[PDB]
Design an enzyme around this catalytic site. Sequence first.
Site, PDB file in Angstrom:
ATOM      1  N   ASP E  56       0.833  -1.197   0.000  1.00 11.24           N
ATOM      2  CA  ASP E  56       0.000   0.000   0.000  1.00 11.24           C
ATOM      3  C   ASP E  56       0.872   1.252   0.000  1.00 11.24           C
ATOM      4  O   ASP E  56       1.792   1.378   0.808  1.00 11.24           O
ATOM      5  CB  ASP E  56      -0.912   0.003   1.230  1.00 11.24           C
ATOM      6  CG  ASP E  56      -1.888   1.163   1.229  1.00 11.24           C
ATOM      7  OD1 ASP E  56      -2.701   1.256   0.285  1.00 11.24           O
ATOM      8  OD2 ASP E  56      -1.843   1.981   2.171  1.00 11.24           O
ATOM      9  N   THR E  89      -4.440   4.233  -3.581  1.00 12.46           N
ATOM     10  CA  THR E  89      -3.443   5.072  -2.928  1.00 12.46           C
ATOM     11  C   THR E  89      -2.227   5.255  -3.829  1.00 12.46           C
ATOM     12  O   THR E  89      -1.740   6.368  -4.015  1.00 12.46           O
ATOM     13  CB  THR E  89      -2.977   4.447  -1.599  1.00 12.46           C
ATOM     14  OG1 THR E  89      -4.118   4.113  -0.800  1.00 12.46           O
ATOM     15  CG2 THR E  89      -2.099   5.424  -0.832  1.00 12.46           C
ATOM     16  N   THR E  90      -1.745   4.149  -4.385  1.00 13.30           N
ATOM     17  CA  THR E  90      -0.588   4.176  -5.269  1.00 13.30           C
ATOM     18  C   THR E  90      -0.912   4.938  -6.549  1.00 13.30           C
ATOM     19  O   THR E  90      -0.077   5.669  -7.080  1.00 13.30           O
ATOM     20  CB  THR E  90      -0.153   2.749  -5.649  1.00 13.30           C
ATOM     21  OG1 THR E  90       0.053   1.977  -4.459  1.00 13.30           O
ATOM     22  CG2 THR E  90       1.131   2.785  -6.454  1.00 13.30           C
ATOM     23  N   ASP E 349      -9.506  -8.464   0.448  1.00 15.12           N
ATOM     24  CA  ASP E 349     -10.020  -7.649  -0.644  1.00 15.12           C
ATOM     25  C   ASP E 349     -11.451  -8.044  -0.990  1.00 15.12           C
ATOM     26  O   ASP E 349     -12.307  -7.186  -1.202  1.00 15.12           O
ATOM     27  CB  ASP E 349      -9.132  -7.809  -1.880  1.00 15.12           C
ATOM     28  CG  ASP E 349      -7.692  -7.422  -1.615  1.00 15.12           C
ATOM     29  OD1 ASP E 349      -7.434  -6.232  -1.341  1.00 15.12           O
ATOM     30  OD2 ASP E 349      -6.817  -8.312  -1.678  1.00 15.12           O
TER      31      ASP E 349
END
Lengths: 103, 193, 481, 62, 481
Positions: E56, E89-90, E349
């Site tokens: 993350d 986020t990335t 997930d």
Amino acid sequence: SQEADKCPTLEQYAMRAFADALEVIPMALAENSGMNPIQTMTEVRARQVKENPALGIDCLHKGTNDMKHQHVIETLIGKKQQISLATQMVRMILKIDDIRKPG
Amino acid sequence: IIKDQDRKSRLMGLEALKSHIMAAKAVANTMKTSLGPNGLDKMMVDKDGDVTVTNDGATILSMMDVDHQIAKLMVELSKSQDDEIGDGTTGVVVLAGALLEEAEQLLDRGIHPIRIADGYEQAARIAIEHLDKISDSVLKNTEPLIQTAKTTLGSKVVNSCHRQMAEIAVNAVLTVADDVDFELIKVEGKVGG
Amino acid sequence: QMLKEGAKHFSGLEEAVYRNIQACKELAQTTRTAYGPNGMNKMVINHLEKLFVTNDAATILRELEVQHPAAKMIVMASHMQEQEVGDGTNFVLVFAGALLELAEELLRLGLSVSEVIEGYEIACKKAHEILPDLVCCSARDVDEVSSLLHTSVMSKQYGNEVFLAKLIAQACVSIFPDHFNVDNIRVCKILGSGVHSSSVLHGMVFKKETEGDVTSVKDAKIAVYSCPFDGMDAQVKAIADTGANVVVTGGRVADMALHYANKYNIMLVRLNSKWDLRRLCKTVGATALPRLNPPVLEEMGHCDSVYLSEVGDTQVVVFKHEKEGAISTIVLRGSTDNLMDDIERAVDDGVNTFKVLTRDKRLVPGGGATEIELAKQITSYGETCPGLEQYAIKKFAEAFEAIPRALAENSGVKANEVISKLYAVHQEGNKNVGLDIEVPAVKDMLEAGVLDTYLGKYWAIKLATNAAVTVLRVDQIIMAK
Amino acid sequence: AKLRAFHNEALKWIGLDLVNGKPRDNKQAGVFEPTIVKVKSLKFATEAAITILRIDDLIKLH
Amino acid sequence: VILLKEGTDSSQGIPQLVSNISACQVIAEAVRTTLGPRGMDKLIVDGRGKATISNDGATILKLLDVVHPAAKTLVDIAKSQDAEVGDGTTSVTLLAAEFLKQVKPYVEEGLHPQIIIRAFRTATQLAVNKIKEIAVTVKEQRKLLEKCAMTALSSKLISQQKAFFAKMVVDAVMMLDDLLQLKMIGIKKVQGGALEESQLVAGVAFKAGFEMQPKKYHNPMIALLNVELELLYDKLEKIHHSGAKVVLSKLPIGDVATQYFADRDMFCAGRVPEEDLKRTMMACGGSIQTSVNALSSDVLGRCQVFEETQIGGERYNFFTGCPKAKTCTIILRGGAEQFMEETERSLHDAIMIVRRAIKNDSVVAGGGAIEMELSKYLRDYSRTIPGKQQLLIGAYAKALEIIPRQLCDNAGFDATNILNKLRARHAQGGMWYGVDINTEDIADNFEAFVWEPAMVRINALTAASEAACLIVSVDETIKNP
């Protein structure tokens, strides 16, 4: 190796390489035994395909010989797990392409 | 400006692959020498001036100055292998290296890292499929048991009497066998004799 | 030997002029970007690793590490301008530089510095005469009020709510402006929700400390204290006899003084800044009672509403609805500290601008309009004033051309083109004609709404002028190391 | 940029009139060049690239 | 003499934007690899040794030694993306940097910064709007949810049994369905057995009381104790006089103490980890007591089933069947840690998707499927919107092609062939055509069951875009060392 052929794609060369990495253990045996690792695998891979995989490398007699007879057996979990652990770790590192470590 | 301060080490691109290759290959070549009954012993003398003549990889890596991350990983492979079943703590090490030694080849060819893992994964999944095929399911078989035990007490300091140790191992396991529990086995150790 | 000791950087005549002017230019241009809705903020971080994101030039200069003599003079110009009306903080800066720039060019040619000042000083008085004649007087009147407040809210980060910040400041400065004072306005930056949640509280907000106390007191009898409540019964008991249901201590309060004030149903508040105490004495009519023995019933101020609101999730006492609340509180709301900072910075400005109205109704069509007009007038004026001064006077005006030049600059519009066009359309559309950045083209500022305060411009010219002049005289200064 | 928008609105006959400085109707203005020129321009220029891209190494020597 | 001291590195004009742009781009690239199901983890070391393996961006940008202004801003963006929607986020970190890469070739040419902000801000708006116009609003229903689960596990190491796991995910999400709080669905991975043994517990389960104690006790009366049960009979009696038949001592339990426990018929485990102690508290509903004398009847939780099985030789206790199990524990069983590890990641997930399914209805084709479309339409709008904005908007669309671009790279497939192969299939099929990385080829996400909340893309665009505007606006950087 043969299964690498039955399945093309770039994974083919991968499986092949994997197999080549499965020859080190034996090659090493011949190495640490004193016998030429190469010349050894020569007789091994040969005497192996001819008399089933029941034949290995006798580091005591310098050469090939039936392991089942030499009483050189090892639990399946040993090898089984061995491949796993090594495979899983190496895989991790392969996914590591950057490590920022301060101090 | 300065993203990462000093005292660091950033591996990017083929720099990350290379480093690990040469770092692991080496650690893999070190243990590889101690593999098999002909294994070459090593002496690990830390900074306290204490000698450490061992044949086990985990015992050699646990006393080896490992600064590189990759090397530490190889140290966790032998440790894990030695904390579960123990036997072959050497193999996993040498094995891991070989694979990487080959991987580098595929890499310099332009083959992406992720992909290498794929092939090695499928192949491994099949490597077991075969190893579990050639196997000859052993029989409360007193004959095979005492044998397998002797194949673990060989090339060691307890090889001079691997027969007595195996005998005890078989009965100990056979007794607490019900699925065998390693807890129902008390190993009392005292000086004398 | 050495004319002067060691570690003494000196500069004489032009040598000094170049340095002073240069340093001022870079400093005047640095903030030049912080002009108009295209104002490009800056991030200054002092030793204490503190990040300051502001668009206000003054705030920038007063946070930048300036050690250059002449350069410091610019920090003063922005300081005074910020203390006068607030708006136009950058106006003075840039302009000040342009002046020096045009003047320096005059010297290199052979012109005497003396004449330079005279010409500039004389044009400074002429302009202060043109502005009052050209200015556009506006109508107080909530209709006109919002107009000026609406033109002072733009050009900032809270432009998305230029309508809300307009009414909020329109209500506050219209409840106690006897002679209005920007000190009777307390702004609070509460995090939580967008700025579209900002409210206008008729009073002063703070933070209590006791729970069991009356969170929402009706006609409260506030008693401002400053002496600590530490030892505790006779102190809190003497407060219940007077009828003080709301205690606003200046210092800390003893735990036993809180439990007692918590038993008497008296809402106690400890740790109250010295300014919050004064603001509470001029809003409810409370007396700054030092000790806890002299308080009585005639020292208690009346506050119809003193409840505990948790807006944004943070407790806050709202002392609203008083007899003669002379101090209101602006309850700001922001999603981030960043937006909350910018907003407040601009709120204060509007507070000063409104303070300018209460003492000056006049207003001019900003956006460069007035600048071009003055430039036009002053230039002509120079031609009417013979002598080498004719050159200095015209040069002074040419400086005003730097204001609109910066406007089209922070927008990417070729100044050379926009300026020439502006003047032409300005010499026909009169004063009102200006520059609309939102739409690169000439436009009537008076119609567009963009109207600045006359007094805001006035001081600017004078302060900037006199200042620049000074920096130009001192053409020789070593030190004394 | 303005040319593109005015090139797909008032059809093909929309180019840049350097004289005035605005997307003007060259067809109506009279600005016309024999298509043969365009052909050769592209053809030559194109072939010109392919060749240089076809160069991996050379040997001129003094 | 000398404005700023020897240390106030002044970067104005362009040498400021550039630097801030380059670093932001490089930082993003670092995580640009952790994108996708087969991302490239990064073992972050804190100099002191402790190595942290994360995928993350946030966790990574929060554990790295950031000492650059424009860099620390990226960490904020990641944190603003991780605290808003979570994933991506990335992405948001990479996009913001990329947006600075496509503008750079324009700045170096003389393209004014402000103007640049106009287009970018205009593009983001035009893009965000489309997200609300091309978002497919789907429907609850255990049938649909289960589908949304198999699609989250498919093309993975768990796909082998994604059929069973998908169910556990749905049920685990259905049970505690009050806006589903991921911080309540626990995942317990324990090596030993086969994935075909993993089950969903209606509470919690931990990794004894006596050899042969009440293995499976009916309705237990949980008795948690922090202090140890060693010096004895006094404490054990107090537990019996409370009705506590099930005790969990955080610290070791006395030898003899354990005896009287098997006599009074009370299951009691020793050395229960602190974390576990709390879990049981949020499970059956038992209150944690430090002393054994403070344990009352209103401190004994309640559960339906409590069994101790040897899953892998090591006896394990289970706490299933809670009145309001608002904290379940998904028990997982496997061969090795790896396989089990991946499992804990796939399910993690899976729960997310099933979650966002019950919450936000409007979803979109992930795998950079939306990006390809946006990039398409945006290019069109370019023609419709002539002038500066034209070329820019186009480049803006070109940038959005990085999500799918790197998407393929994070697997080993050629980014070129796919990118082009995508634009083609996209301009023929629909807004559902994306890039099934798991198969390294284009495919319709509507059928590939590849979806993601409409918010996601929205929260990314704005936040990521506006960030760039900042670095662009601030055309100067001063600090004052």
